[PDB]
């Protein structure tokens, strides 16, 4: 089937889904391929073409180091890119319900991967199920990542930082100009992303540029105010230089460092990236977003406090076990291959892995708030506690704190705490309800009968409906199959719905005790040293 | 007199009314005659004409089976079409006050007849009285009905469903483009309809298409949420196919079934219509509205709950005896020709007629809530109770429930309970204040002195004034002839005005006990079986 | 309860449900609460397939056999509705399904829902009311694991028996201590907080919101609308099926 866009005609394909039809346009270019001179620059606009683009393959993932800790292990490879890596990677997918609606609501997916990795083309981001089941147009884009997407040399026009964010933004502009031709409704666009894809979404709530480019926003396990999310102006300078040194790019004429790196291979850049930071963590974001003065026009960490953002409804949530995923990538005593029971000495071995540049009081205080058990019996004591440290600290408390500061200014916020564990989950039980493992449900994967427990097909169906109802109508309610209605998260009561296969309840003040610590006591201990 | 419309000049006539003058344009085409290829398709736009249309006859009623249960009986023939049946029937009438106003408020009539029947041209829908008495422009249209108006083959472009609704919609667009030429005010249009004409109006409150095509809405004895009102996507599929089989239209190439039926006679279609459903009821709506994804963009039954509809004032009401009308068309023991006293065995004989696909608990529960009398004396016990079952269930509870869920979202809702019985009524006393017998009063029929009790001339004059004041000003008050003012129906108190010839009172919570049953206990009993 | 309280005209002057409906009761504070598994204790004393000596993993038919036991004079359709509400299995998996179904049927109907209804009707007249959900299995419990947090077995803790450093785990001695402090505080001060050992404060059960406090060795949350679905069934729907029954 053919569709006429502002750049030229495009040819898509017709997938068979649930005894009916969806129409897919995979890998549509939306920007000029950021090659050679353009590398590091903001995405340039795209020249028209008088033929037809064959939007029938998935396109290239952007350049990134691939995870190699567990080769052949699905648990980690289901996250690895499944298309040729290439600097020529600025493409987007569109999935339309059949028959062409009408004036359809648009869902836009922004993938995560701590700004270092990710790709639109993953199987768990397959938009076909959503389009067909809920008659929505789903859209996802590739945007640059790592130094190629986030190299900052402050103010300097040929290395401004936030390139990857601009990529998302331009893709959003594409949908604003072109989606009507597809039957979609530019005045209803919900942005949705996960982890660093959620920090991204949250940043678009701040970005004067993005402001008129979407209606609403969904924020799965991530927000700009999370500790990993935003690079300071001068951490970024330091990093860009350290790279220059690691590759033989040191100079004086500052533009030349950028002429220097423009001429290296993606690979001389890639291998060195991991080494530009003094001491790492498994969550180290070497090239993420910076306050660039163009995209972000001022520290986000302030715009929030003073109410400067798009005022609209938001859906935000986290997972029961955000922190476990990380423990197998640095923390002594941990292996995906046994019950990972750990010793107190090892817990502290662990604390230095996750908080390397922190005081002795910092750690001993973390230690104290997390390790006074009612019955110091359960051999899993420490193992569970290192996970909650990593979780609460980097994901839960930031997310809840974001939802507070934002809903403070009059808008509707709904919050979820997702806590069912996939029957299919390739990691072991101790790891629980890991980071990034609700995406399957959101994208409606357990809907595909030929796979999942029947319970999970109910659970995906709910989340799917709830999501679409939020996109369409600004309300993540599921009205038919007798549910319990989802209360709006206000600053006093602080209500959030729990998601699982066997009892959704309304609960208040998630992580009360633990966010206090992370939100006031701990940062105070940090003021004392550094 | 001549008027220039966007399609061409039109010639109307001048009726003599109440010692003054009204100007009438009967049977104006507003769509392309849905013939041959167009049958089943949405109404096509209409080519200009350079002569003059002679809008001086009533036009054709659309094809429908006529009621033949009581030939010669006025009570049923006053409802039967009074113009040649024809597939060429998309016409509208306009009645203008003389002399040509000005910037007049517009009332639009949508006739009922459980989507199977009806016609604009009935004597009880004569708009001349209203136009003259209240200086309003009245407008009514013919729209397709039965399978010809509501054949659904989901998404399939040449049999989309809701054709008859689109007919109404296009007629509404006509008024938006043309009414100013007549002296009417497109920024004040009240929609008003009865029964299935009220379900229609309620559907236009949901329909993105209709949204900017009227100001306000009046809903007499009907709403989409009534049990008869809306066909499920797959009841509709099943029905369309069963028809195909009943006529020798079975196929595989699905479009061909539609090419097949396109080539049959209205009559091979008509006689079979009654037979496409497994078991009937006297209220069976074989081809009604469906969730089509184009007109209705999602289950209405949800759009309501989530507040997605035109936010405006509404007038809604029912009649003291909505249910009696139906009892003479299936229910054992019932005849318009004696006091129809019935036995308990027969009451249950009756319950299976009106609830055929329901459990044994379903019926025995209905039985229980309706048949515990204070004094099981009155021989009319069961007779009255089968009427209220049919009434409360299909008309009263749905209507009240609609008024709740809608007014929940901030708009003004007024509710009436009309309860005077026409002195002229051709059916017998036991039947009481039947379904569809307030229309006479609304259209101002007892105003025509030469006929009705003087009391009824007062009663019509009130309702007439109240209606116009709602259309013009959004307030169904009657300020002069010392009335009692009509309170707004809010969700707490739930006030409604009673209409009759000898005491209008403000009362609360109509049918409290009975709607509880129909609204929670009963549907719960239904969850247990099916 | 073959020989119990009646309206004698002397101790109870009128029907208790009336007195409660119309607010004829001593206006004061109360502390109410129930145990996670009230019902189970009674399934060993009559219900087919139940023993304190095994798995007790029962089949559908012994579920219905069991219903006949606990609802002797309840209509054909009456029982069937209790069946539908509690056997709503998303996945037909757990071999332990109907076992817990029956547990809950007996608990919700005889203990939890009447307790909850009680607190509402009482709070409605504007006295403080405190509701708890005791959800901790004593390690000492002689009864089998499946019987859970049984009827009667919160008393050990209220009377301070886990305080005896000679027996109970150390956590049970913490939980017992709090409960003991909460209990004494309430009695002294009409307010069952544990203000020291940094508790989570225990809010009033207001007629609207329906807050309650969970009591355990572990996750001590404040929660809302306990057994909300189950008690709608027992509160309004089931009493409307009894009105047909006879
Ligand atoms: C699970 O596996 C891990 C990793 O294989 C075991 O952790 C190891 O502990 C010993 C001494 O600390 C060393 O042989 C390894 O170097 C450790 N792993 C690393 C690299 O940190 C752990 O003991 C196992 N746990 C069990 C059996 O529960
Ligand atoms: C009123 O008339 C009706 C219909 O003519 C009478 O109902 C009939 O009852 C007997 C036995 O049930 C039969 O002769 C008919 O078949 C019935 N009608 C039908 C078709 O259902 C009814 O008895 C009369 N009632 C009175 C005298 O009050
Ligand atoms: C498998 C199982 O444990 N079931 C038995 C049951 O058949 C027996 O009647 C009951 C009472 O003695 O004890 C137990
Ligand atoms: C894509 O393939 C189609 C086959 O139908 C063909 O028309 C065309 O050559 C291809 N498009 C391009 C970009 O050449
Ligand atoms: C889609 O809906 C919006 C309002 O949400 C409206 O303004 C727009 O015109 C509609 N577009 C089409 C083509 O239906
Ligand atoms: C609700 O109804 C049934 C389960 O009874 C299920 O098949 C259907 O998908 C549900 N709908 C939603 C949107 O959850
Ligand atoms: C309608 O009748 C009038 C008589 O005044 C005449 O002018 C005309 O021929 C007729 N119109 C049409 C459609 O021919
Ligand atoms: C009629 O009234 C409306 C306001 O209700 C106004 O905007 C419009 O211009 C008026 N039209 C004429 C022709 O008087
Ligand atoms: C009120 O006044 C008289 C009855 O006294 C009647 O003729 C007139 O029509 C009434 N007006 C209305 C609008 O009811």
UniProtKB/Swiss-Prot annotation, chain C:
Catalytic machinery residues: 38 (charge relay system), 151 (charge relay system)
Residues that carry a glycan: 54, 193, 197-198
Superkingdom field: Eukaryota
Record localization: Secreted
Q: What is the effect of changing residue 7 to M?
A: Does not affect enzymatic activity
| Disulfide-bonded cysteines | 113-231
Q: State the tissue distribution.
A: Detected in blood plasma (at protein level). Present in most cells except erythrocytes.
Instruction: Provide the residue positions that the database annotates as binding tacrine.
Output: 151
PTM characteristics: N-glycosylated. No other PTM detected. The major N-glycan structures are of the complex diantennary type with 1 and 2 N-acetylneuraminic acid molecules (Neu5Ac) making up approximately 33% and 47% of the total N-glycans, respectively. Only low amounts of fucosylated diantennary N-glycans are detected (approximately 2%). Triantennary N-glycans with or without fucose amount to approximately 13%, whereas 5% of the total N-glycans are of the oligomannosidic or hybrid type.
What is this protein's function per UniProt?
A: Esterase with broad substrate specificity. Contributes to the inactivation of the neurotransmitter acetylcholine. Can degrade neurotoxic organophosphate esters.
Complexes and interactors? Homotetramer; disulfide-linked. Dimer of dimers.
- Which clinical disorder is mentioned? Butyrylcholinesterase deficiency: An autosomal recessive metabolic condition characterized by increased sensitivity to certain anesthetic drugs, including the muscle relaxants succinylcholine or mivacurium. BCHED results in slower hydrolysis of these drugs and, consequently, a prolonged neuromuscular block, leading to apnea. The duration of the prolonged apnea varies significantly depending on the extent of the enzyme deficiency.
Q: Which family does it belong to?
A: Belongs to the type-B carboxylesterase/lipase family.
Q: What is this protein called?
A: Cholinesterase
Organism of origin is Homo sapiens
């Amino acid at each position: 089937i053919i569709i006429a866009t502002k750049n030229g005609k495009v040819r898509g394909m017709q997938l068979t889904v649930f005894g009916g039809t969806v129409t897919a346009f995979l890998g549509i270019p939306y920007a000029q391929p950021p090659l050679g001179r353009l590398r590091f620059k903001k995405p340039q606009s795209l020249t028209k073409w008088s033929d037809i683009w064959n939007a029938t393959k998935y396109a290239n993932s952007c350049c990134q180091n691939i995870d190699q800790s567990f080769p052949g292990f699905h648990g980690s490879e289901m996250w690895n890119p499944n298309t040729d890596l290439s600097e020529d990677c600025l493409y987007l997918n569109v999935w339309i319900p059949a028959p062409k609606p009408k004036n359809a609501t648009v869902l836009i997916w922004i993938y995560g991967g701590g700004f270092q990795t990710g790709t639109s083309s993953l199987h768990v981001y397959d938009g076909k199920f959503l389009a067909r089941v809920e008659r929505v147009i789903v859209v996802s884009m590739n945007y640059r990542v790592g130094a190629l997407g986030f190299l900052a040399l402050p103010g300097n026009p040929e290395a401004p930082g936030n390139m990857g964010l601009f990529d998302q933004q331009l893709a959003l502009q594409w949908v604003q100009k072109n989606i009507a031709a597809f039957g979609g409704n530019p005045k209803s666009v919900t942005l949705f992303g996960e982890s660093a894809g959620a920090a991204s979404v949250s940043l678009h709530l701040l970005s004067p540029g993005s402001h008129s480019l979407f209606t609403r926003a969904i924020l799965q396990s991530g927000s700009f105010n999370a500790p990993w999310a935003v690079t300071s102006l001068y951490e970024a300078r330091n990093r860009t230089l350290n790279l220059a040194k690691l590759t033989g790019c040191s100079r004086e004429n500052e533009t030349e460092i950028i002429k220097c790196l423009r001429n290296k291979d993606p690979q001389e850049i890639l291998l060195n990236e991991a080494f530009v930071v003094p001491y790492g963590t498994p969550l180290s974001v070497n090239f993420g977003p910076t306050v660039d003065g163009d995209f972000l026009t001022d520290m986000p960490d302030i715009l929030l406090e003073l109410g400067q953002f798009k005022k609209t409804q938001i859906l935000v949530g986290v997972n029961k076990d955000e922190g476990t995923a990380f423990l197998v990538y640095g923390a002594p005593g941990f292996s995906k291959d046994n019950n990972s029971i750990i010793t107190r000495k090892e817990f502290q071995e662990g604390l230095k892995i996750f908080f390397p540049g922190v005081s002795e009081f910092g750690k001993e205080s973390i230690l104290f708030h997390y390790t006074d058990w009612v019955d110091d019996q359960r051999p899993e004591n420490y193992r569970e506690a290192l996970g909650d440290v990593v979780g609460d600290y980097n994901f839960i408390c930031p997310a809840l704190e974001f939802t507070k500061k934002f809903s403070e200014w009059g808008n509707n916020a709904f919050f979820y705490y997702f806590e069912h564990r996939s029957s299919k989950l390739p990691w072991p039980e101790w790891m629980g309800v890991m980071h990034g493992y609700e995406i399957e449900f959101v994208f409606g994967l357990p809907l595909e009968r030929r796979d999942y427990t029947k319970a999970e097909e109910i659970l995906s169906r709910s989340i799917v409906k709830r999501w679409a109802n939020f996109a369409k109508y600004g309300n993540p309610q599921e009205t038919q199959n007798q549910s319990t209605s989802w209360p709006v998260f206000k600053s006093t009561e602080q209500k959030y719905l729990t998601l699982n296969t066997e009892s959704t309840r309304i609960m208040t003040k998630l992580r009360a005790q633990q966010c206090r610590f992370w939100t006031s006591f701990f940062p105070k201990v940090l003021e004392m040293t550094g």
